[PDB]
Amino acid sequence: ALDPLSETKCTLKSFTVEKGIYQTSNFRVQPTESIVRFPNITNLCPFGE
Amino acid sequence: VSMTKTSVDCTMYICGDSTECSNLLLQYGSFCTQLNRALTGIAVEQDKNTQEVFAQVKQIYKTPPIKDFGGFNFSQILPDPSKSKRSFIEDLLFNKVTKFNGLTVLPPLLTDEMIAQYTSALLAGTITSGWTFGAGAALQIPFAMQMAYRFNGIGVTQNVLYENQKLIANQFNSAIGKIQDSLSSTASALGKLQDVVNQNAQALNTLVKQLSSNFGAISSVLNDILSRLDPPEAEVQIDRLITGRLQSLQTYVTQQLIRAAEIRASANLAATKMSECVLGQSKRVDFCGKGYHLMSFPQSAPHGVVFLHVTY
Amino acid sequence: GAISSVLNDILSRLDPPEAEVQIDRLITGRLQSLQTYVTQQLIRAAEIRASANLAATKMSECVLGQSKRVDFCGKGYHLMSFPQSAPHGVVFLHVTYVPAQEKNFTTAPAICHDGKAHFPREGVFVSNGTHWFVTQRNFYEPQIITTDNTFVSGNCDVVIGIVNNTVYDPLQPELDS
Amino acid sequence: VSMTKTSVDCTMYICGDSTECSNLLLQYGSFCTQLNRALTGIAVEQDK
Amino acid sequence: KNKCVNFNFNGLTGTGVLTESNKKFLPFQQFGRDIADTTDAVRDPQTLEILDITPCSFGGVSVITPGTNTSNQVAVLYQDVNCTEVNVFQTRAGCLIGAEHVNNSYECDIPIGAGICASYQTQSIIAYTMSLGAENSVAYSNNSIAIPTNFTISVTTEILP
């Protein structure tokens, strides 16, 4: 989790890494906000009656 | 020659946007590790099949300015550099062929433009140099004298070649028009390539439909069974969806690996006909189709190759 | 899916009605591990067996004879081959024929002596600036024009691009000298 | 050259003549259909 | 819009990206599904607006690395995405962070994808379009020939299992 240079050594299980392209992990966009959009309000409900 | 380079992630397919799914997925150990390395190892071998068939020589040859090859019309075989660099035959092959769901489709290393550039290097080598460009240096030879060694290699006198230059030129150019009228009328001639597409398009869409199964649980959605049920009750239904989709992922790896071994024997057969029938004069009977072999012309194709054998 | 990977820990700690569920998940979990080992070692062995048929062909055809197949015994014209022992494989030693240097020349398809066309048996006529001679395509060897190296076929009125020369008959130093 | 054209049905082998068995068989998706189409695709290649 | 958020449209919870398309909803339908029968499109409860549920961006992460006895510089590779929300150059295969793009073509040492390769030349990882071979123009004519006058008997090595 430090650098992509040492990240290749974890998925290869070898200290000496030759030339080439090696897949290490995958990325994913994390959710930040939330959409709570709803239609408007016209009156108040008569729950007190 | 090649297939569709589909890379399916083992983690984000079964456990896409879920936290409790990843806790039970690691209990199988290296089951997701072997399925990710198997689909990755197939896609490397798909790019290696195009390098053994198309990339036969280490030099790129261009078309000569003299287009009079003894009366033969090679304008339909050689690609047009003024437009993608594809010929009229290659345009009929690419026009008759047929997102974030865990299935990532990777593009190949050798693109369709570079396939036609590798094809045009072999077209100029067979016509202007014969078999000398594959066996050594680019030894130039005229096309009227190139066919003199081709007729003598099958037991035909070379006197008939020079006396009938315009006779065999009209018969050759009429045969090219029969191929272009057959490919443009219907796509039934591409049945050797449509079986590779239908085994890669329908099998890709099947894996998207296999995650909708409940596998004995209430619903296939991980959010509808974890936040709406008890955490003792959600542990069983998630594990039924994990084990139900793990056997679906192991089936997709197993079925595509036999098709990858099937496409590898077809690529070695296509590399054999490119190295023998295209890059030389082969005396093997029925190696370039029915009849005595004279020459061959390769063509570009989506995830494949098309040979235009010339027989006698 | 079980609580441990040891078979002795589930039977000793959990109940025998309860341990049989986690044992069967360990059996079926290792059965799928064995289904992966059998399948992957069978598909990869089919590619070795497909390569073994190619290795047996190049040791029975290229070694025991002269193969005329292009790029089968390697690059160039095949002369001979020598196989050697290797652990779980074989290493080929193909002796090929590769050209080194070449020059540019002017050619002609045939010549004309007395009205008939003279075509060579193997090669083509090459002019060095004064006259044409008989030579081979693979190796440059200037030879004289004679009936033993040429063949009389056709006429000299329909061949496109033909030239005129003199065929040196071997009876001409014996009779016409 | 070829072999026998054995096409084992997915439904009749496991859930032959049973109604409640098909509810636990078709809940796994098209895995039953993939077993029938693979054995059918072999018999096409046996004819080729 | 165009953000990986946790949408909530009339109880339809989930995580997706609110994108626009040309899909026109029917007046009785309230949600659309894909071929996986999942959450694919939702309807705006306030007006007549169609907001499709796009899944958030993911992909494989590869590392372009040379040999251990050559160098130690690496580059970050992203698959099937652009350099929009992921020193940094855009390639045909994806977005690359840590390598420079060179218009000159060289020999393919480490492949990237879609005709692009990378190599370590004197002293950083560069991105370039791979070459298919050297240019060789055959001097074609009506009587020109190239007959070999000297030959070399070379021995090749082939290793097959």
Side-chain angles (χ1 to χ4, degrees), chain C residues 6 9 11-13 16 26-27 39 44 50 57 61 83 102 115 124 129 143 145 148 161:
Chain C
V6 188
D9 297 0
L11 190 61
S12 301
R13 295 176 58 181
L26 275 177
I27 293 178
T39 310
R44 288 175 180 180
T57 311
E61 170 191 346
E102 68 276 351
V124 85
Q143 300 179 0
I145 302 178
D148 301 0

CSV table of all heavy atoms in Angstrom, one decimal, chain C residues 6 9 11-13 16 26-27 39 44 50 57 61 83 102 115 124 129 143 145 148 161:
chain,number,residue,atom,x,y,z
C,6,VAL,N,-9.3,-27.5,9.8
C,6,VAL,CA,-8.8,-28.7,10.3
C,6,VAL,C,-10.1,-29.6,10.5
C,6,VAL,O,-11.1,-29.2,11.1
C,6,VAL,CB,-8.1,-28.6,11.7
C,6,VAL,CG1,-7.4,-29.9,12.1
C,6,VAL,CG2,-7.0,-27.5,11.5
C,9,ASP,N,-10.8,-30.5,14.3
C,9,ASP,CA,-11.3,-29.5,15.2
C,9,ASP,C,-12.8,-29.3,15.2
C,9,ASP,O,-13.4,-29.0,16.2
C,9,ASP,CB,-10.6,-28.1,14.9
C,9,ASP,CG,-9.1,-28.2,15.1
C,9,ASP,OD1,-8.6,-29.2,15.5
C,9,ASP,OD2,-8.5,-27.1,14.8
C,11,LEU,N,-15.1,-31.8,14.5
C,11,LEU,CA,-15.7,-33.0,15.1
C,11,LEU,C,-15.6,-33.0,16.6
C,11,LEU,O,-16.4,-33.5,17.4
C,11,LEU,CB,-15.2,-34.3,14.5
C,11,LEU,CG,-15.9,-35.6,14.8
C,11,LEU,CD1,-17.3,-35.6,14.3
C,11,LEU,CD2,-15.2,-36.8,14.2
C,12,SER,N,-14.4,-32.5,17.1
C,12,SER,CA,-14.2,-32.6,18.6
C,12,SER,C,-14.9,-31.5,19.3
C,12,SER,O,-15.4,-31.7,20.5
C,12,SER,CB,-12.7,-32.5,18.9
C,12,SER,OG,-12.0,-33.5,18.2
C,13,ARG,N,-15.0,-30.3,18.7
C,13,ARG,CA,-15.7,-29.2,19.4
C,13,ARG,C,-17.2,-29.1,19.2
C,13,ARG,O,-17.9,-29.1,20.2
C,13,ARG,CB,-15.0,-27.8,18.9
C,13,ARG,CG,-13.6,-27.7,19.3
C,13,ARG,CD,-13.0,-26.4,18.7
C,13,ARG,NE,-13.7,-25.2,19.2
C,13,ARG,CZ,-13.4,-24.0,18.8
C,13,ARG,NH1,-12.4,-23.8,17.9
C,13,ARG,NH2,-14.1,-23.0,19.2
C,16,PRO,N,-21.9,-33.7,16.8
C,16,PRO,CA,-21.9,-34.6,15.6
C,16,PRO,C,-23.1,-34.3,14.7
C,16,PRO,O,-22.9,-34.6,13.4
C,16,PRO,CB,-21.8,-36.0,16.2
C,16,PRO,CG,-21.2,-35.8,17.5
C,16,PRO,CD,-21.7,-34.5,18.0
C,26,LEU,N,-16.3,-28.5,3.7
C,26,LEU,CA,-14.9,-28.7,3.5
C,26,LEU,C,-14.6,-29.8,2.5
C,26,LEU,O,-13.6,-29.7,1.7
C,26,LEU,CB,-14.1,-29.0,4.8
C,26,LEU,CG,-13.7,-27.8,5.7
C,26,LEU,CD1,-13.1,-28.3,7.0
C,26,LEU,CD2,-12.8,-26.9,4.9
C,27,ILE,N,-15.4,-30.8,2.3
C,27,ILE,CA,-15.3,-31.8,1.3
C,27,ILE,C,-15.6,-31.2,-0.1
C,27,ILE,O,-14.9,-31.3,-1.0
C,27,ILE,CB,-16.1,-33.0,1.6
C,27,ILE,CG1,-15.5,-33.7,2.9
C,27,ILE,CG2,-16.1,-34.0,0.5
C,27,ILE,CD1,-16.3,-34.9,3.3
C,39,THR,N,-9.0,-30.1,-14.4
C,39,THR,CA,-9.3,-29.5,-15.7
C,39,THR,C,-8.1,-28.7,-16.2
C,39,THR,O,-7.8,-28.7,-17.4
C,39,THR,CB,-10.5,-28.5,-15.5
C,39,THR,OG1,-11.6,-29.3,-14.8
C,39,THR,CG2,-11.0,-28.0,-16.8
C,44,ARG,N,-4.0,-27.9,-20.4
C,44,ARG,CA,-2.6,-27.6,-20.7
C,44,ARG,C,-1.8,-28.7,-21.2
C,44,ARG,O,-0.9,-28.5,-22.0
C,44,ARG,CB,-1.9,-27.0,-19.4
C,44,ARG,CG,-2.3,-25.7,-19.0
C,44,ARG,CD,-1.7,-25.3,-17.6
C,44,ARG,NE,-2.1,-23.9,-17.2
C,44,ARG,CZ,-1.8,-23.4,-16.1
C,44,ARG,NH1,-0.9,-24.0,-15.2
C,44,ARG,NH2,-2.2,-22.2,-15.8
C,50,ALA,N,-0.5,-31.3,-28.4
C,50,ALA,CA,-0.5,-30.7,-29.7
C,50,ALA,C,0.9,-30.2,-30.1
C,50,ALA,O,1.3,-30.3,-31.3
C,50,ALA,CB,-1.5,-29.6,-29.8
C,57,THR,N,7.0,-34.5,-35.5
C,57,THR,CA,7.1,-34.3,-36.9
C,57,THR,C,8.4,-33.7,-37.3
C,57,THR,O,9.0,-34.2,-38.3
C,57,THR,CB,5.9,-33.4,-37.4
C,57,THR,OG1,4.7,-33.8,-36.8
C,57,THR,CG2,5.8,-33.4,-38.9
C,61,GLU,N,10.6,-36.0,-39.9
C,61,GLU,CA,10.6,-35.5,-41.2
C,61,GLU,C,11.8,-34.5,-41.5
C,61,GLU,O,12.5,-34.7,-42.5
C,61,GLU,CB,9.3,-34.7,-41.5
C,61,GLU,CG,9.2,-33.9,-42.8
C,61,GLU,CD,8.0,-33.0,-43.0
C,61,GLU,OE1,7.1,-33.2,-42.2
C,61,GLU,OE2,8.1,-32.1,-43.8
C,83,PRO,N,18.6,-33.3,-33.4
C,83,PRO,CA,17.9,-33.2,-32.1
C,83,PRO,C,18.9,-33.5,-31.0
C,83,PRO,O,19.9,-34.2,-31.1
C,83,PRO,CB,16.8,-34.3,-32.2
C,83,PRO,CG,17.4,-35.3,-33.1
C,83,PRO,CD,18.3,-34.6,-34.1
C,102,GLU,N,24.0,-9.9,-52.2
C,102,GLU,CA,23.4,-10.0,-53.5
C,102,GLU,C,23.6,-8.7,-54.3
C,102,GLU,O,24.0,-7.7,-53.8
C,102,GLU,CB,21.8,-10.2,-53.4
C,102,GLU,CG,21.1,-9.1,-52.9
C,102,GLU,CD,21.0,-9.0,-51.4
C,102,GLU,OE1,21.5,-10.0,-50.7
C,102,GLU,OE2,20.6,-8.0,-50.8
C,115,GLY,N,14.4,-18.7,-84.6
C,115,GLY,CA,13.0,-18.6,-84.7
C,115,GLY,C,12.2,-19.3,-83.6
C,115,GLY,O,11.1,-18.9,-83.3
C,124,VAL,N,17.0,-18.3,-65.1
C,124,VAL,CA,16.6,-17.3,-66.0
C,124,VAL,C,17.8,-16.7,-66.6
C,124,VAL,O,18.9,-16.9,-66.1
C,124,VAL,CB,15.7,-16.3,-65.3
C,124,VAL,CG1,16.5,-15.2,-64.7
C,124,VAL,CG2,14.7,-15.7,-66.3
C,129,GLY,N,25.6,-6.9,-69.4
C,129,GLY,CA,25.9,-5.7,-70.2
C,129,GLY,C,26.2,-6.0,-71.6
C,129,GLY,O,26.1,-5.1,-72.5
C,143,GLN,N,26.9,-19.7,-66.5
C,143,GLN,CA,27.2,-20.9,-67.3
C,143,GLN,C,26.8,-20.5,-68.8
C,143,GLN,O,26.1,-19.6,-69.0
C,143,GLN,CB,26.3,-22.1,-66.9
C,143,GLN,CG,26.6,-22.6,-65.5
C,143,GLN,CD,25.8,-23.7,-65.1
C,143,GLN,OE1,25.0,-24.2,-65.8
C,143,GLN,NE2,26.0,-24.2,-63.8
C,145,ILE,N,25.3,-21.0,-72.6
C,145,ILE,CA,24.0,-21.4,-73.1
C,145,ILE,C,24.1,-22.6,-74.0
C,145,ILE,O,24.9,-22.6,-75.0
C,145,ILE,CB,23.3,-20.2,-73.9
C,145,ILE,CG1,23.2,-19.0,-73.0
C,145,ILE,CG2,22.0,-20.6,-74.4
C,145,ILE,CD1,22.6,-17.8,-73.7
C,148,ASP,N,21.8,-28.6,-73.0
C,148,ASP,CA,21.7,-29.3,-71.7
C,148,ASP,C,21.1,-28.5,-70.6
C,148,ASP,O,20.6,-29.0,-69.6
C,148,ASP,CB,23.1,-29.9,-71.3
C,148,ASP,CG,23.6,-30.8,-72.4
C,148,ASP,OD1,23.0,-31.0,-73.4
C,148,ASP,OD2,24.8,-31.3,-72.2
C,161,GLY,N,8.3,-9.6,-74.5
C,161,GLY,CA,9.5,-9.2,-73.9
C,161,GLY,C,10.7,-10.1,-74.2
C,161,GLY,O,11.6,-10.2,-73.4
